[PDB]
């Protein structure tokens, strides 16, 4: 997932200065300005709160697979914070699989878990 994250963040990092006037449709607005801003939002971290590598993998996979495209930027951090608790409550199988195999779990199971969490989230 690091490969996709690098590309998204880099693209935002050469296209931030053009934000004076968003235009050119997908070449600037829908992908570069949105995905990059969401990446910057998810890469922020609070003081003295390290998080497990499995949770990092979950959240960055969710970012890269476009599951955060509908969430507004102001709600991204709260989405991540609630997603960590939802994982701790319902995704023990996924967390154990990652912790024991150093590899991503089944893609369909991961996608259905992410969708199940996104069902219960409220945008505010």
């Amino acid at each position: 997932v690091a490969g996709t994250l690098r590309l998204d963040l880099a693209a935002y990092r050469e296209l931030e200065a053009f934000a004076q006037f968003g235009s050119d449709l997908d070449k600037a607005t829908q992908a570069k300005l949105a995905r990059g801003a969401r990446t910057v939002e998810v890469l922020k971290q609070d003081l003295h709160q390290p998080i497990p590598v499995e949770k990092q993998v979950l959240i960055i996979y969710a970012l890269t697979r476009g599951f955060l495209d509908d969430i507004p930027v102001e709600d991204v951090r709260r989405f991540e914070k609630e997603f960590y608790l939802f994982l701790d409550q319902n995704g023990q199988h996924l967390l154990e699989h990652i912790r024991t195999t150093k590899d991503l779990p089944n893609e369909d199971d991961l996608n259905k878990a992410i969708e199940a969490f996104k069902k219960t989230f409220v945008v505010s």
């Binding site: 053009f18 004076q20 006037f21 235009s23």
Partner: protein, 283 residues
């Protein structure tokens, strides 16, 4: 050179670079908005072209291919130029071509007659020996039809009474953001068209001699409005490319000056080290 002067030079160049980059950023949005106005202009012009391409063939009118609108010494030129500068040779090309053609064909200042839209055009024409009829100092960057509707109506009225021999518009189209070329054209007396008639009664409750005198002026005014919109788009593109080139040149100068400063100050540092070494040795 002196490090103080070098630093002041670099700081001034950086400030100019920032200003030019801001200008280019603004011009980009202005071009993006002007393109939509051009696209919105297109349909009305297309409808008028497909409407007037056939009914023009017929009896004489106020603006038919007559060339006898007092065909003496009073032809008018519509010159379109920017209001602000920083666009390079944009206004200069149009001004030079207008001056050259008018000086060639017109022998005496009485033969001269022009109308200009743009402060630089007024300035250059007043510096030269030109007669000014009407002028517009400034227009919105996204002009509506009503902004020049009355002026185009005045041009048509001056074509009436024979006070315009024939009308010429001089402006610049854009092939793209990079390419702009100067256009000269002969508009009102309507030299050429094409026959595509499928019409018998469509808006024909007035006769051919009764509808032309009213219909043709709006056709000319719409053409003038479209030419103005295209010229505005060309102006925005020219400012874009000029500011981009200015930023590139300023960054090149910044790089060279920073290299010079860094190469210069290390010599002073090493000279200080040498002085320290010599002082320590001498004791």
């Amino acid at each position: 050179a002196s490090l103080r002067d070098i630093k002041t030079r670099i700081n001034a160049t950086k400030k100019t670079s920032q200003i030019t980059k801001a200008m280019e950023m603004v011009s980009t949005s202005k071009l993006n908005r002007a393109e939509q106005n051009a696209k919105s202009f297109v349909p009305y012009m297309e409808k008028i072209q497909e409407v007037v391409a056939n009914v023009a063939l017929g009896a004489g009118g106020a603006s038919h291919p007559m060339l006898v609108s007092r065909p003496v010494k009073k032809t008018g030129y519509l010159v379109i130029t920017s209001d602000r500068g920083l666009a390079g040779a944009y206004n200069s090309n149009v001004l030079r071509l207008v001056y050259q053609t008018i000086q060639k064909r017109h022998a005496s200042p009485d033969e001269y007659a022009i109308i200009v839209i743009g402060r630089v055009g007024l300035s250059f024409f007043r510096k030269r020996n030109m007669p000014v009829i009407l002028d517009i100092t400034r227009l919105p960057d996204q002009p509506s039809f009503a902004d020049i509707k009355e002026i185009a109506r005045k041009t048509v009225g001056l074509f009436a009474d024979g006070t315009f021999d024939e009308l010429y518009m001089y402006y610049n189209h854009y092939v793209s953001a990079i390419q702009q070329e100067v256009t000269e054209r002969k508009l009102l007396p309507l030299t050429d068209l094409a026959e595509n008639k499928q019409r018998t009664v469509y808006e024909f409750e007035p006769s051919q001699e009764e509808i032309l005198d009213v219909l043709l002026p709006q056709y000319a005014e719409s053409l003038i409005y479209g030419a103005l919109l295209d010229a505005k788009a060309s102006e925005h593109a020219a400012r874009m490319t000029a500011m981009k080139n200015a930023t590139d040149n300023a960054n090149e100068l910044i790089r060279t000056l920073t290299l010079s400063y860094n190469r210069a100050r290390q010599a002073a540092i090493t000279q200080e080290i040498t002085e320290i070494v010599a002082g320590a040795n001498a004791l």
